[PDB]
Protein: AQUAPORIN-1
Organism: Homo sapiens
Amino acid sequence: KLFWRAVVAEFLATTLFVFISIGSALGFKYPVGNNQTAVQDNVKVSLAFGLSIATLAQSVGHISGAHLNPAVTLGLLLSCQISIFRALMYIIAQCVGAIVATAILSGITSSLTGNSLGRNDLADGVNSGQGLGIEIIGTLQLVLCVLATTDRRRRDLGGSAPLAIGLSVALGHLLAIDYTGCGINPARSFGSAVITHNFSNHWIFWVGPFIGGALAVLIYDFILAP
Amino acid sequence: KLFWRAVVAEFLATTLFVFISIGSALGFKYPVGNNQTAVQDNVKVSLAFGLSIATLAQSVGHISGAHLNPAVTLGLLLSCQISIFRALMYIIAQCVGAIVATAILSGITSSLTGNSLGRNDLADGVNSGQGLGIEIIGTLQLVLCVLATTDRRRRDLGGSAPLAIGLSVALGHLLAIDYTGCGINPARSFGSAVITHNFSNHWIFWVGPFIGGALAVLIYDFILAP
Amino acid sequence: KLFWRAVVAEFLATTLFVFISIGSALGFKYPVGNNQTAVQDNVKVSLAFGLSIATLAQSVGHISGAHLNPAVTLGLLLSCQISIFRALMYIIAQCVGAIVATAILSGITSSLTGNSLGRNDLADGVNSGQGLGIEIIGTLQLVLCVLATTDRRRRDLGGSAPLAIGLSVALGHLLAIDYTGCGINPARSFGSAVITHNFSNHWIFWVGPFIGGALAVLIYDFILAP
Amino acid sequence: KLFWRAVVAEFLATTLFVFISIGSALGFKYPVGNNQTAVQDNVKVSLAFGLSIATLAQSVGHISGAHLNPAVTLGLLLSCQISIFRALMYIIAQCVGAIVATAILSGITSSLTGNSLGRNDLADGVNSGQGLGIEIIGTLQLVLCVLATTDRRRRDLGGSAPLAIGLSVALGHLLAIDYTGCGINPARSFGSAVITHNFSNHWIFWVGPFIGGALAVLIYDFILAP
């Protein structure tokens, strides 16, 4: 029964997550153009995405669904069994949540209109192929810490891990951000794209996190043999 | 006897809280107009409100009154008994403290006068109905974490929760802020309004936190049955 | 023997502390005038003073001298005995350290010269009597948390308190800063003044922290009877 | 067998570290000149280097190789035996990693070209001999905390230390930064220099950390006798 509140636990959560995130960012560009946000001061933006996850993680399901992206899950699968690993649901959740996440935004935020957007949070690029690697190295540590944190002992009473992970993820963004918006999570993309998505990129983004996370568990496995 | 230092514990605290908060914010707009604060760099502002609560929470009453807003309390009530739940006092406290909080400000801060104010920290709006939801989603996690943190085990010797909660609350603000100033707390409103409060808003603000927190404990209850 | 490394432990530490602090701040105003620092972005400045203390506290003497200001110490005295409480040394230390702290600065930092200074970090004021209270409310929580943290259990293996206290102190600054530079510590003043100190203020600053801390332990005592 | 994944553990890690670090920094100066980054808002930059290490440390080898610089290691040696202390490898690692770290950068980041660089992250200087001391005082606490944290008890289940150390190191940067870029680590230098390194400085930088760390363990030893 749990596996189901579990999904919703994330269906919901993730939504809340991406809304805030997309909240603050857009939060900053808005009253009449040229005053503070000609081009918004990046860390707070990082902070929003950053801190967010750790809170939302400290609250939701614990040993089970807490996270909010596909890369983490597979990193997990990687072992001997898919007999119970129907984590593919988690992804569809993480995806559907994102859409009512971006959707609920346009609803309120509906006057943000110069050559108006609330833009593809990511694949925009005044770059070419560089965009690719950057994110793939970042999730590498995220997934890394995500599993590190887990080895012997499970969930908190001192709450370090979540605070940890959250700010860890934050790191991704400080950097992730400029070149092509923050990319450590699949869901974050669809929601943005749902309007007009022009880059073959935002998903070369996905395979990225996977692969970043691919060598991530591969390098975390040989660390010392399970 | 405790229930009473308890109230004062918060009467006082909260006051200290909102003063700092209103301190820094106003802190930034002031020497002669056009120099740094044409429109103040938002996160530190978030930081003040943000960090503040966690300190003030780590210090005051522990199992009992530590918090500083009405939404948290009801989230608590929600169970089977008001036989001892005269938490309505806590609210009047949280309200009275706020007034000597804003009051003590005008006393010192008394030269901040262009078309001078120390403004309705919140309901200002270059928006319409959007303002409503935004805050209602934010307190959702605050109250969420506030109760999550509490389930089995009570108060700290490793002090995570408070540090947690504080920065959690901080999240609310990073975002909460731009559209219509930070709104996760009833008290924060009166104190600001005490001068000239023009919006039917700042309290549609209250019912908001409640309702955000309303579905908040409702969703935290079905999480797994008490 | 310990009481002595203890003092030096702080003699030294505090020095290191105030140097960094005075480091970053001055750090920001310097290459040729009008480019980034017309008037330096305040939180990092807060961060330096802020984070600093928590590190330096996590490292130095533990049950004993860790702190770096006079207000904390007296808050401590307040009990029944000065038979062993010759904490007045600690102050002279905290004072002497500050001078080689500011001194060692002028040595390196020696080209920072427009109408050049590395100014009275604090009492400057485009204000009058407001400056007074502001800091007195801030140390109130610092001292508060400083003692809260201590009640039943002593020093860390999970290291929360220091991280706590540090960022707690940080709070003071975010706000403390603008009106008249950050004021939660006696030492910080002398070192700055050692050159040309014009305000009857910077020490009405001292009596402030004391008194802030005075009612601080008085309110922390009645909290629940020792 | 461990001593070897150990080195790679750092060979790799450190690389990841310096890339992000050099990532964000460069991250900020780039789209067409005069828009936000005329001269980049320093703390986030601090954050990247800052938070980074704590994550990467929370994930890699634990009792053993976690760190990412030469100063920490010797501080360690300092005791009675080099029979097993072939930590000189660690340095060559920390050095080689840095080069594929800066290298992999130029590969992606390859359009950042005004009078283009991705500059000597450090020894630049509109100063003379001041540059020298500044960093030597900073690592003093880093190494300090690095060893403090270690005394009686080893590695985390509450994860404080790493979070600690990371932000501790962050402190170095907030300040370290302006005068001559952040300097608390040997590796960080080579990678930058690998192109065109003009200062006798960046290594007077090394002897610095050592010596900062030299008196660092000397002062941490007399603290209380091993």
Remarks:
- Chain D has one domain: 1-226.
- Chain D touches chain C at residues 38-39, 41-43, 46, 126-127, 129-134, 137-138, 140-141, 144-145, 148-149, 153, 158, 160-161, 163-164, 167-168, 170-171, 174-175, 177-179, 219-220, 222-224 (CB under 8 Å).
